[PDB]
Design a protein around this motif. Structure first.
Motif, short mmCIF file in Angstrom:
data_model
loop_
_atom_site.label_atom_id
_atom_site.label_comp_id
_atom_site.label_asym_id
_atom_site.label_seq_id
_atom_site.Cartn_x
_atom_site.Cartn_y
_atom_site.Cartn_z
N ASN B 18 0.69 7.59 7.51
CA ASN B 18 -0.32 6.57 7.48
C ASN B 18 -1.56 7.06 6.72
O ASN B 18 -2.68 6.63 7.03
CB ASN B 18 -0.71 6.10 8.89
N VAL B 19 -1.34 7.88 5.71
CA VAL B 19 -2.45 8.31 4.87
C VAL B 19 -2.68 7.28 3.76
O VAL B 19 -1.73 6.89 3.06
CB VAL B 19 -2.22 9.70 4.22
N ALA B 20 -3.93 6.82 3.59
CA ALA B 20 -4.22 5.83 2.54
C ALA B 20 -4.29 6.55 1.19
O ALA B 20 -4.80 7.69 1.07
CB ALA B 20 -5.53 5.08 2.81
N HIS B 22 -4.94 5.64 -3.03
CA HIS B 22 -5.37 4.68 -4.03
C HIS B 22 -5.14 5.31 -5.43
O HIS B 22 -5.53 6.50 -5.68
CB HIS B 22 -6.87 4.46 -3.83
N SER B 37 -2.02 0.95 -4.57
CA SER B 37 -2.46 1.68 -3.40
C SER B 37 -1.46 1.43 -2.30
O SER B 37 -0.65 0.51 -2.43
CB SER B 37 -3.89 1.20 -2.98
N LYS B 39 -0.10 3.00 2.06
CA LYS B 39 -0.21 4.04 3.09
C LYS B 39 1.08 4.82 3.22
O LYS B 39 2.16 4.20 3.12
CB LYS B 39 -0.58 3.41 4.41
N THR B 40 1.02 6.15 3.35
CA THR B 40 2.28 6.91 3.49
C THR B 40 3.08 6.48 4.74
O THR B 40 2.50 6.17 5.75
CB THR B 40 2.08 8.41 3.59
N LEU B 46 5.10 7.51 -0.12
CA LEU B 46 4.65 6.19 -0.50
C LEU B 46 5.45 5.82 -1.76
O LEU B 46 5.28 6.46 -2.83
CB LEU B 46 3.13 6.24 -0.76
N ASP B 65 -6.71 9.79 0.82
CA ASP B 65 -7.80 9.76 1.83
C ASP B 65 -7.61 10.75 3.03
O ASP B 65 -7.38 10.33 4.17
CB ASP B 65 -8.10 8.33 2.23
N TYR B 69 -7.58 10.69 7.56
CA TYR B 69 -6.39 11.30 8.19
C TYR B 69 -6.76 12.37 9.23
O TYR B 69 -6.29 12.31 10.41
CB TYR B 69 -5.47 11.93 7.11
#
Lengths: 116, 115, 115, 116
Positions: B18-20, B22, B37, B39-40, B46, B65, B69
């Motif tokens: 859930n890492v963003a 971009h 972009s 989220k993992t 991703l 991001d 995290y």
């Protein structure tokens, strides 16, 4: 100072202090013989392991006791230790810095080798 | 899938979930324009960022991001984000995987470029 | 597949192919006994090292033959091999991926331990 | 010396010398303003970027010009540069060392932060 070991903690962003380090040298019979040992200082460095006279050609293993380090910090890490194995001084004396960057499930090690 | 991002957590020894992420493409005026972009996933990956048709040669920046995290894990981090900037060239192989390995005060990133 | 090894080449930006990998299990007399071995595939992976039945708790060492890898590429390396030593515990998750990222004078290794 | 940058070459096992480094600080209007710059020395270090007086709280970006470095060595690398972005001095002045370890398709960066 032909061989220096430097250890950093990647979780805190700081030198890794009081890390035990044991160096071995591969013997004729092929086993690992104890060569030198020490603990890192407040800067994360370990100086004085050896002298140019003693540090002859051979295959060396630098064991860095990462599991004791993490546990004294109350953390349960993956690896027993980090082991760095290399041939040294086989075209003359060099200065070797073995750096390691530690996280609980991961580490990096780098050798900086300069001509004395 | 010409561009894939993969993130690992070196403190827990797990995919970073859930890492963003971009991605931006450099525009002719020199600003970065949003490009893709996401989220993992649960495996730290991703997929589906772009298509061959859209991913033309150009200079790209991938921002990961990390700060948010680490904060969701209650762990105090150093960087605002991790940033990987590179030129995509049609010469070299054809799929780009940007991999990153995160610690709170350190990260590494590697480009795996294959056929 | 409880134990997988994955190796990347940071100089070429590619999987590290045909890298020899030997795994040892510590025996009661304290010597390392050969346990499994293989060569990484075209995607830099080595699958099929053991089975659940054989991979019991114990202390294991994974030796990755980096020196011969760099020499086949004509590139002068520093280490004899990269060595990852760890205890396998039935407590934690169930699959272990040992990943390593190689440069001639530097490497990193990461344990990805998942369910 | 509140901010120091150190760069190593992972292919040769040596300091990365003559690496250009540019620091920016995020401005009120939100853009990156030039803050300081320099080149690494023969030890791979860049000292004197700034002073405790100038190095105020803010968000800083340290761009390390890895692509020029590799190309001056005749090598064609993956990344344009390595960029390290962080908030500095927001609970008082610290000393920051930004280390980077470079390979042509990969780099690592670590921050060592100590209380001055």
């Amino acid at each position: 100072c032909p061989l220096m070991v430097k250890v950093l903690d990647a979780v805190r962003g700081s030198p890794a202090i009081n890390v035990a380090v044991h160096v071995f040298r591969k013997a004729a019979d092929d086993t690992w013989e104890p060569f030198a040992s020490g603990k890192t200082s407040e800067s994360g460095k370990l100086h004085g392991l050896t002298t140019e006279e003693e540090f002859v050609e051979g295959i060396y293993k630098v064991e860095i006791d990462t599991k004791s380090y993490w546990k004294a910090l109350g953390i349960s890490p993956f690896h027993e230790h980090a082991e760095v194995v290399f041939t040294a001084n086989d075209s003359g004396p060099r200065r070797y810095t073995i750096a390691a960057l530690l996280s609980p499930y991961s580490y990096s090690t780098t050798a900086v080798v300069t001509n004395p």
